[PDB]
Protein backbone atom coordinates (compact mmCIF):
# COMPACT_ATOMS: atom_id res chain seq x y z
CA UNK A 1 0.00 0.00 0.00
CA UNK A 2 0.86 3.64 -0.87
CA UNK A 3 0.74 6.54 1.64
CA UNK A 4 1.03 10.31 1.75
CA UNK A 5 2.40 12.34 4.72
CA UNK A 6 1.97 16.12 4.91
CA UNK A 7 3.38 18.87 7.08
CA UNK A 8 2.36 22.54 7.08
CA UNK A 9 4.34 25.47 8.58
CA UNK A 10 7.48 23.60 9.63
CA UNK A 11 10.60 25.77 9.65
CA UNK A 12 13.02 25.24 6.73
CA UNK A 13 15.47 23.49 9.13
CA UNK A 14 12.81 21.14 10.36
CA UNK A 15 11.56 20.28 6.86
CA UNK A 16 15.15 19.61 5.75
CA UNK A 17 15.48 17.09 8.60
CA UNK A 18 12.26 15.42 7.61
CA UNK A 19 13.40 15.05 4.00
CA UNK A 20 16.84 13.79 4.83
CA UNK A 21 15.60 11.18 7.37
CA UNK A 22 12.66 9.99 5.31
CA UNK A 23 15.05 9.45 2.42
CA UNK A 24 17.48 7.40 4.56
CA UNK A 25 14.68 5.26 6.01
CA UNK A 26 13.15 4.53 2.63
CA UNK A 27 16.34 3.57 0.87
CA UNK A 28 17.17 1.32 3.83
CA UNK A 29 13.79 -0.34 3.13
CA UNK A 30 14.39 -0.35 -0.66
CA UNK A 31 11.23 1.62 -1.54
CA UNK A 32 10.18 4.49 -3.86
CA UNK A 33 9.71 7.94 -2.31
CA UNK A 34 8.55 11.32 -3.65
CA UNK A 35 9.15 14.46 -1.64
CA UNK A 36 7.61 17.81 -2.54
CA UNK A 37 8.26 21.09 -0.80
CA UNK A 38 6.95 24.63 -1.29
CA UNK A 39 6.85 27.58 1.08
CA UNK A 40 5.25 26.26 4.26
CA UNK A 41 4.39 22.91 2.78
CA UNK A 42 6.04 19.50 2.73
CA UNK A 43 4.60 16.38 1.27
CA UNK A 44 5.97 12.81 1.17
CA UNK A 45 4.48 9.97 -0.98
CA UNK A 46 5.72 6.41 -0.37
CA UNK A 47 4.33 3.80 -2.70
CA UNK A 48 4.38 0.09 -1.73
CA UNK A 49 4.78 -0.39 1.93
CA UNK A 50 3.85 -2.78 4.59
CA UNK A 51 1.63 -0.79 6.93
CA UNK A 52 4.08 -1.39 9.81
CA UNK A 53 6.81 0.35 7.78
CA UNK A 54 4.52 3.23 6.86
CA UNK A 55 3.54 3.88 10.46
CA UNK A 56 7.23 3.66 11.55
CA UNK A 57 8.33 6.19 8.93
CA UNK A 58 5.48 8.54 9.83
CA UNK A 59 6.55 8.38 13.48
CA UNK A 60 10.24 9.18 12.61
CA UNK A 61 9.25 12.00 10.24
CA UNK A 62 7.38 13.48 13.20
CA UNK A 63 10.45 13.10 15.46
CA UNK A 64 12.63 14.59 12.74
CA UNK A 65 10.14 17.42 12.49
CA UNK A 66 10.91 18.30 16.16
CA UNK A 67 7.20 18.25 17.11
CA UNK A 68 6.51 18.55 20.82
CA UNK A 69 5.07 15.73 22.93
CA UNK A 70 1.40 16.84 22.66
CA UNK A 71 1.79 16.60 18.83
CA UNK A 72 3.68 13.28 19.19
CA UNK A 73 0.88 11.77 21.34
CA UNK A 74 -1.63 12.64 18.63
CA UNK A 75 0.69 11.08 16.09
CA UNK A 76 0.71 7.85 18.09
CA UNK A 77 -3.06 8.11 18.42
CA UNK A 78 -3.24 8.46 14.68
CA UNK A 79 -0.93 5.42 14.38
CA UNK A 80 -3.36 3.25 16.37
CA UNK A 81 -6.33 4.56 14.41
CA UNK A 82 -4.86 3.95 10.93
CA UNK A 83 -4.06 0.34 11.98
CA UNK A 84 -7.42 -0.54 13.50
CA UNK A 85 -9.37 0.79 10.55
CA UNK A 86 -7.13 -1.09 8.06
CA UNK A 87 -7.71 -4.22 10.14
CA UNK A 88 -11.47 -3.71 9.40
CA UNK A 89 -11.04 -2.83 5.66
CA UNK A 90 -7.64 -2.88 4.01
CA UNK A 91 -9.17 -0.71 1.21
CA UNK A 92 -10.62 1.97 3.48
CA UNK A 93 -9.70 5.54 2.63
CA UNK A 94 -8.25 7.06 5.82
CA UNK A 95 -7.41 10.75 6.27
CA UNK A 96 -6.10 11.76 9.69
CA UNK A 97 -5.27 15.37 10.44
CA UNK A 98 -3.52 16.84 13.45
CA UNK A 99 -3.08 20.44 14.55
CA UNK A 100 -2.64 22.47 17.73
CA UNK A 101 -6.34 22.11 18.69
CA UNK A 102 -6.65 18.37 18.18
CA UNK A 103 -7.17 15.55 15.81
CA UNK A 104 -9.65 14.52 13.16
CA UNK A 105 -10.10 11.07 11.56
CA UNK A 106 -12.11 10.47 8.36
CA UNK A 107 -12.70 6.98 7.08
CA UNK A 108 -14.52 5.85 3.95
CA UNK A 109 -15.02 2.10 3.81
CA UNK A 110 -17.21 0.78 1.04
CA UNK A 111 -20.40 2.75 1.63
CA UNK A 112 -19.56 3.50 5.33
CA UNK A 113 -18.44 6.93 6.48
CA UNK A 114 -16.86 7.57 9.86
CA UNK A 115 -15.78 10.95 11.22
CA UNK A 116 -14.10 11.38 14.60
CA UNK A 117 -13.08 14.81 15.91
CA UNK A 118 -11.26 15.55 19.15
CA UNK A 119 -10.02 18.69 20.89
CA UNK A 120 -7.77 18.64 23.94
CA UNK A 121 -8.07 14.90 24.38
CA UNK A 122 -5.84 12.04 25.58
CA UNK A 123 -4.53 9.37 23.19
CA UNK A 124 -6.44 6.81 25.30
CA UNK A 125 -9.74 8.60 24.64
CA UNK A 126 -9.13 8.49 20.88
CA UNK A 127 -8.49 4.74 20.92
CA UNK A 128 -11.72 4.13 22.82
CA UNK A 129 -13.65 6.29 20.32
CA UNK A 130 -12.10 4.33 17.43
CA UNK A 131 -13.05 0.96 18.96
CA UNK A 132 -16.60 2.22 19.47
CA UNK A 133 -16.77 3.46 15.89
CA UNK A 134 -15.66 -0.03 14.76
CA UNK A 135 -18.28 -1.67 16.96
CA UNK A 136 -20.95 0.33 15.19
CA UNK A 137 -19.58 -0.56 11.73
CA UNK A 138 -19.41 -4.22 12.75
CA UNK A 139 -23.05 -4.08 13.85
CA UNK A 140 -23.99 -2.74 10.40
CA UNK A 141 -24.05 1.04 10.85
CA UNK A 142 -23.27 3.06 7.71
CA UNK A 143 -22.38 6.34 9.41
CA UNK A 144 -20.74 7.18 12.69
CA UNK A 145 -19.82 10.66 13.85
CA UNK A 146 -17.97 11.22 17.12
CA UNK A 147 -16.91 14.55 18.61
CA UNK A 148 -15.07 14.89 21.93
CA UNK A 149 -13.79 17.96 23.78
CA UNK A 150 -11.72 17.69 26.97
CA UNK A 151 -12.71 20.15 29.70
Amino acid sequence: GSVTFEFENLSEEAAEKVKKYVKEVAEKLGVEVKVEEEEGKLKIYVENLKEEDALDIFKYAALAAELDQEYLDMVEAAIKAYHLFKEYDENATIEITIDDEGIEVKVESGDRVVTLKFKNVSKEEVEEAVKEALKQLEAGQKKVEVEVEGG
Binding site: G1, S2, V3, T4, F5, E6, F7, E8, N9, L10, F58, A62, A65, L67, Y71, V75, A78, Y82, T93, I94, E95, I96, T97, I98, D99, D100
Partner: peptide, 8 residues
Protein backbone atom coordinates in the same frame (compact mmCIF):
# COMPACT_ATOMS: atom_id res chain seq x y z
CA UNK B 1 0.57 26.53 13.65
CA UNK B 2 1.61 23.04 12.54
CA UNK B 3 -0.67 20.68 10.71
CA UNK B 4 0.29 17.07 10.08
CA UNK B 5 -1.76 14.69 7.93
CA UNK B 6 -1.48 10.96 7.00
CA UNK B 7 -3.71 9.81 4.05
CA UNK B 8 -4.53 6.60 2.11
Amino acid sequence: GQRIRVRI
